């Protein structure tokens, strides 16, 4: 249909540096659609950020803060969207299941 | 910090 996001977890956004200029900050909702991401407001209804995996060049997981550097490719550009998690759980669950779902992208995306 | 990478981002 479109909306099929395969996980979702709740983070509250933190001000770091994308989230900064350009306002993005408050309560948002990591949604993993197996091959795009979907930040959403818990007080909006449509997506708010919707990225990709294919343009985020990394996402680290420092127990509670799960940050995601986004590179060129990026809905907003270089830069990083840094958050915090219930504890040092929530991060641990939402980077091993996003871990799975990017892998099986870049491994069943094509040899050469 | 841990930290982990994108397998799909190509680069």
């Known amino acids: 249909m479109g909306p099929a996001f395969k996980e979702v977890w709740q983070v509250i956004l933190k001000p770091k540096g994308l989230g900064q200029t ?10 993993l659609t197996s091959k ?11 997506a708010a950020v ?4 294919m343009n985020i060049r990394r996402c680290g997981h420092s127990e509670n803060f799960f940050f995601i ?5 990026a809905v ?3 830069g990083e969207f840094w958050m915090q998690v219930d504890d040092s759980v929530v991060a641990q669950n939402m980077h091993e299941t996003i871990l ?12 050469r | 910090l841990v930290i982990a990478g994108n397998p799909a981002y190509r680069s």
């Open chain 1, 22 to 31: 350009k306002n993005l900050i408050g309560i948002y909702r990591l949604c």
């Open chain 1, 36 to 46: 795009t991401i979907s930040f959403v407001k818990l007080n909006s209804e449509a």
């Open chain 1, 50 to 53: 919707v990225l990709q995996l």
């Open chain 1, 69 to 73: 550097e986004v590179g060129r490719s």
């Open chain 1, 76 to 78: 907003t550009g270089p």
């Open chain 1, 100 to 111: 799975e779902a990017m892998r099986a992208m870049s491994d069943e995306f094509r040899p």
